[PDB]
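Input record (Table S2, row 1008):
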Amino acid sequence: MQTYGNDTVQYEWWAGNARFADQSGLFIAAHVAQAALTAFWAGAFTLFEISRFDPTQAMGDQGLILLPHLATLGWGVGDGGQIVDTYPYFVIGSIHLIASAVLGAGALFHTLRAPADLSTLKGQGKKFHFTWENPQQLGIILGHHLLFLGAGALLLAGKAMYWGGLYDATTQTVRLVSQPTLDPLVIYGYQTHFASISSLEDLVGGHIFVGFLLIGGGIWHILVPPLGWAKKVLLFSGEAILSYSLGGIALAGFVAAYFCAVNTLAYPPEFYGPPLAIKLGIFPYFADTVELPMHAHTSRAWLANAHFFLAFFFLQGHLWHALRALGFDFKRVEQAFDSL
Amino acid sequence: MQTYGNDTVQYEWWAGNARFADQSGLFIAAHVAQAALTAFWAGAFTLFEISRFDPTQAMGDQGLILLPHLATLGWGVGDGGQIVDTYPYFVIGSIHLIASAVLGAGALFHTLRAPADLSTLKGQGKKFHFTWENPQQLGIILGHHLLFLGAGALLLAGKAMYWGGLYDATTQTVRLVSQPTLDPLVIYGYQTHFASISSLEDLVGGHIFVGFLLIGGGIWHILVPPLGWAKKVLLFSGEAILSYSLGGIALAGFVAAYFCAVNTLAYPPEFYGPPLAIKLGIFPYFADTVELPMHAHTSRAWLANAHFFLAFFFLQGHLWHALRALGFDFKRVEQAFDS
Amino acid sequence: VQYEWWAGNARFADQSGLFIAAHVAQAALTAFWAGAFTLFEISRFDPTQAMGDQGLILLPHLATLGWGVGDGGQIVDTYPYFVIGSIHLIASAVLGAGALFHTLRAPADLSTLKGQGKKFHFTWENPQQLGIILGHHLLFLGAGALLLAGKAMYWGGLYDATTQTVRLVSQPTLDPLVIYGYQTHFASISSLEDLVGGHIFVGFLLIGGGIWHILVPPLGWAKKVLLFSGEAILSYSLGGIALAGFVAAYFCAVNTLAYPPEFYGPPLAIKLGIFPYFADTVELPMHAHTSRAWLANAHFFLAFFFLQGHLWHALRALGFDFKRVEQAF
Ligand code: CLA
Ligand code: CLA
Ligand code: CLA
Ligand SMILES: CC1=C(/C=C/C(C)=C/C=C/C(C)=C/C=C/C=C(C)/C=C/C=C(C)/C=C/C2=C(C)CCCC2(C)C)C(C)(C)CCC1
Ligand SMILES: CC1=C(/C=C/C(C)=C/C=C/C(C)=C/C=C/C=C(C)/C=C/C=C(C)/C=C/C2=C(C)CCCC2(C)C)C(C)(C)CCC1
Ligand SMILES: CC1=C(/C=C/C(C)=C/C=C/C(C)=C/C=C/C=C(C)/C=C/C=C(C)/C=C/C2=C(C)CCCC2(C)C)C(C)(C)CCC1
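Output record (chlorophyll A complex):
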């Protein structure tokens, strides 16, 4: 936390998650409980989407949110964009459900059996003890999360190359994509038309390039400690790293909301509905060209608008926490109105 | 119980059943009274169901639940899934009533004639007294229960192999199977596809295998105590062992609800109804494929959905007793919202 | 201790004369119901119709023995019912005579007598004289079993419902291994000759039990596994009579051999709604039932209520007077 003086600070219940921000074990426990909640939502809602799926209609009109996310990977897709056999969606939903179960079990284990601070441990638990002031352990955690995201990108790459086939909007069948792009100059040139790429080989080439970039960043962050040039320009607290991550996930949400509404192959038009139109009224939303009867919207509209609004409010959360990390009081803005 | 204040911690009447967690003389009376109520349900409710039975309609139509539980054992079913008499269901319910009567008598004995403690005797009861600190005696009680469960499994195998025939979904006849399964390779292969078996012989062979496995586990728990790493990893208390068993019975209830949902040979489709579909709305219910006239359900749904709910709430009871055994009092939650 | 007037018969626990008097008076009331209601519910009888439809309650038991019935199962007389009712009248007379003589004239404490009364006083802490009373009662019940055995040899034998004849039984079973295997074949033997053949074995068993109880007292373990108080001995007797009432309700439900089906009623059906009961296969419209359903249901409910009375006296005997007060703090 910030703690502009008053080192022994007490937070009330409406800021109740600020109480464990200094301790270590509850800091692990709350986050793995949150990951259990995300895995539970994923598995339980693709099961709920299998429960409320009709094969006599098109996909995106009935609010199909997760089954197009699995059909773009090409798991149970047939011919012409038709889904007749849904075994592996139920398989990955059950996998995510039991994964949420074991993650919640570990969360309650760290809340109950593991102590608050990991400095009282003796074996490997003392090596996992972290503080918001030393950047070395934070760099180790940073590099290992970099390595895990790179491993996830490599798993997606193997799903595109060896472990299965992806889906395209041209042939509307599965496709075993091999021999991707190997040139980084055209990847440097992809900063202008990244929204419409229209080729899956370029997609898996960009994915293996960003995956190898992530592995390089991971081994770089594990190998060298963080330097001194960034410690003079970046703040080192809980709310500072919270702010950097909040701005990162808000930018990622804006990027994903732009990617959802205009793409055609990473979001097929028969699975998510037609591509959208960026329409600014009061706020910039995404409207469909055709109008659904029961005031309804496609999955593309729901995904793009929800991710845009969540990215917007996460940007203001980054703003709140980043101004908090710079020393602002925030009753100073109430004292500025009260002095007036 | 965690013994917060001391061993004589107070309890109100909404938790008064925690008062005999350390007495170990009222434990016996409460448990065999629950066994008496279980046998009372098992007998009196099939006596209730034998009065409202219709021979023309299907058994999964009006809500017959216990009679399809006995019809798959081949007691009073004719050819093609039709019931020809009501006598063996009546005598099985009657002997369950007699077992309930003698177990309730033993319960009133153990709460009335037997003392509140069991270490206060001088005969065989001194060797029967248990408490929640020693691993070897509790392992002995566990091994005795494993021997009893394996004996029940071998009794089921003897019923299927020597005490008449059995119903199947292949020939639709009361069939006496023979030559059960020896190799565990198909038993290992059934671990990844346990929904459909397509063999009654492999079912009774797996039953003989798990029965012998339970006799072996009971003998192992009788002879040798826990080696020492269980005292380091696990816990040994009332609430901890209760939570272990609650998680076990919740997992058993989950897999039993799923086995009632998908399978169609252990539960015959002409007796319970058509095989259900796992429809997750606000909760996962195992819904029918046909529709009943006035808000009714088939008996397979009444089995599977109720056992799913009971497995869910027993999972949360396992969570409650696990947190109770791990030093959490649930009084820091009400104390973390003040000031 | 003191008992209120709403429940004050517990004073018979120490007074022995009233203990004899009230029970012999109760037996006089039973014999008065046996004699008087046979001679009073005879005007409801009509041999033109059936015996199961009118609701005759006593006379089925008299036609069970095979006194005034012949071929086809028809009643042509009343005079055997008259002589059995009349001996029940004079038996109730002499039994009530001894009853009120013990109530009014005999002393209460039998140990304060001089002749053959001081050797007749009983109490609740001895296994010897109570064993003598048990032996004499076992002798008399075995004598009643001997009378049932002699009914199949003296007056033409019992009545058979299968062959529709009052046949003389003269084939006793000389093997107790059939008696062992009867626990599956309860009320389904399809033979009337095997009932008397099972009655002579249990009759000689009753004589042997009475001889064992007269000759030797409880030799030591009955002082430990059992109690001798009045409430506990009442509990044991009520449990025995409740088991008897339940098995008699089962015999009135399922047998249709000892009870003739053309006289008592059709075979019954075991049902359960709120309480378990028995219902006829052929119902009657005027809110009436056969003697089978009436007897089986009433004996089932009375056996249940006397099982509850057995549990009440067992809780009263073993110190559980009022201990559920400590539920609420
Ligand atoms: C990375 C995510 C993240 C994390 C870890 C935190 C963490 C924290 N924030 Mg926070 N915040 C975030 C994102 C995040 N914030 C965003 C995106 C916003 C913008 C809206 C804010 C705005 C914000 C404010 C304004 C304040 C905090 C405060 C705090 C601190 C106290 C704990 C707390 O939140 O109270 C516990 C949380 C609650 C009691 C929840 C409040 C109940 C809300 C109103 C209901 C949820 C709204 C809605 C229904 C959500 C669903 C949306 C849609 C599906 C309908 C804690 C360190 C407080 C602080 O620094 O004081 C010490 C504080 O005053 N945050
Ligand atoms: C094998 C199962 C088992 C056993 C032996 C116990 C044993 C115990 N539990 Mg328990 N529990 C269980 C399962 C079990 N629980 C499950 C599955 C849950 C989740 C719901 C709980 C939740 C729970 C709580 C929240 C608490 C206990 C407590 C206790 C202890 C005190 C006795 C008691 O319950 O109060 C005496 C019993 C009663 C008062 C009976 C109440 C019955 C209510 C009125 C039923 C309401 C109807 C309900 C909807 C169910 C309907 C079923 C439907 C089919 C009709 C005792 C050691 C308490 C404790 O730790 O001590 C303080 C406590 O606070 N338990
Ligand atoms: C052979 C059978 C037998 C015997 C000898 C006894 C003997 C005794 N019982 Mg008893 N009891 C029995 C069977 C028996 N009971 C059965 C089967 C039940 C269950 C229904 C009970 C329930 C019972 C209770 C609940 C109590 C006794 C008590 C007593 C003792 C006090 C004296 C007495 O009877 O009060 C005489 C009492 C009355 C005559 C009742 C008053 C009048 C009522 C209101 C009328 C009867 C109600 C009934 C509905 C009428 C219609 C009859 C119906 C068949 C049509 C005495 C030792 C009491 C005790 O322990 O001592 C204080 C006591 O509290 N008994
Ligand atoms: C708040 C809080 C917290 C947190 C926690 C959490 C948040 C949790 C979560 C957790 C979770 C979230 C969990 C999960 C679980 C899971 C489960 C419970 C599952 C189950 C399921 C099932 C069993 C299923 C089944 C099936 C299958 C498998 C298939 C077929 C069909 C069916 C569907 C039936 C803490 C403690 C830290 C602190 C305090 C407060
Ligand atoms: C090709 C392609 C692709 C790929 C992509 C990629 C590969 C990307 C990358 C990306 C990246 C690679 C990005 C980056 C960016 C960055 C940023 C966004 C940053 C920001 C930040 C800032 C600006 C900060 C600053 C600072 C510092 C550094 C320190 C001092 C102070 C300050 C704070 C100021 C895809 C798949 C789509 C498809 C196909 C095509
Ligand atoms: C053949 C026949 C017959 C006959 C019958 C008889 C012969 C019967 C018998 C019966 C019997 C012969 C029975 C038995 C039973 C038994 C019981 C029922 C017992 C009980 C007991 C008790 C309850 C006791 C116990 C105890 C002891 C010992 C001690 C400890 C504790 C106690 C108390 C628990 C008739 C006529 C039908 C006809 C036809 C044929």
